[PDB]
Design a protein around this nucleic acid. Structure first.
Ligand code: MG
Ligand code: MG
Ligand code: ZN
Ligand code: ZN
Ligand code: ZN
Ligand code: ZN
Lengths: 162, 162
DNA sequence: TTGACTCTCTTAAGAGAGTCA
DNA sequence: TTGACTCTCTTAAGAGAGTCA
């Protein structure tokens, strides 16, 4: 809600609840042929999810609190960043999963960045494979690799140059 | 259904027409601090675009030919790939700009791959910066770099470990 | 047969808000 | 007040199809 104290209280209540979510160990590629371990705090698959939480989509949740007798509601991963600018360079800031695990609500696995930066981590080589993200990746992106291109650039005639 | 010969004739007429689009020389990052040059064949900003071409969206076009009294229409960048499989690993194939220049219709700047592979090229370090795409990038992706993350992973209490 | 417009849809990373009990 | 559902929207890489003369 409006006050800084109220916002800090929301963040603190969210942290306490998410901190009681099951902790699931995930072994992940780091790049460079190395492996690491992440501890994700995973929201349950079905209700009940935890105090203040409700599912608005297959992998979307919201956090809700009643403050000045009115309901305030946020996307469930946005709560750690309520005191941060909500835009950057005119682009909306989004909660971005460094662990590439939507159910995870561990704030140590989240950052706050443009949707383009967010998406791009899917292809990052990872913290031991050449990640250049200033806020470093925790793992190699799940889509990193050679791809599966069906056909490359080609022409039948002689009209084009690269 | 169109025969192989008919499809080849469509590809040939498309190439003939695109080969008359204005050819624009662009200097581009290749990765590794090297610069290179790409020659894009750019569809005009407004009508007329060229024989067979029409705009269906701000940066979307279609190619249309009438064969034996039947109107056939294709996405304007899909025509080079009409003799290729239209799916791979259960995913639809998409025309993918290696030059990242949507108006360009140079078939030497296009490949045919899943939408995920297509998107991921936006963040690739480039052919001289570590590209691992099996069908190699022509340039560093426009969104490659450290990013502009507003806030990194953080907690107020001690409920979490990474 | 052709040009120049019109409309909505797909995907996978993300969102806001309303209806009930 | 809190929980458990419902709906549609945003973005930027991509699509299909209709109307009229
Ligand atoms: Mg993400
Ligand atoms: Mg592309
Ligand atoms: Zn996690
Ligand atoms: Zn990274
Ligand atoms: Zn081009
Ligand atoms: Zn590449």
């Amino acid at each position: 809600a409006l006050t800084n104290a109220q916002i800090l209280a929301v963040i603190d209540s969210w942290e306490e609840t998410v901190g009681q979510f099951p902790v699931i160990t995930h072994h992940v590629p780091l790049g460079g042929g190395l492996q690491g371990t992440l501890h994700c705090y995973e929201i349950p698959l079905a209700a009940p999810y935890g105090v203040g939480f409700a599912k608005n989509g297959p992998t979307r949740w919201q956090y809700k609190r009643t403050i000045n007798q009115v309901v305030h509601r946020w996307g469930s991963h946005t709560v750690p960043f309520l005191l941060e600018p909500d835009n950057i360079n005119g682009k909306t800031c989004t909660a971005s999963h460094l662990c590439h695990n939507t159910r995870c609500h561990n704030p140590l696995h989240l950052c706050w960045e443009s949707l383009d930066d967010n998406k791009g981590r899917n292809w990052c080589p990872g913290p031991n494979g050449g990640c250049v993200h200033a806020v470093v990746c925790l793992r190699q992106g799940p889509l990193y690799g050679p791809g599966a291109t069906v056909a490359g650039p080609q022409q039948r005639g002689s009209h084009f140059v690269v």
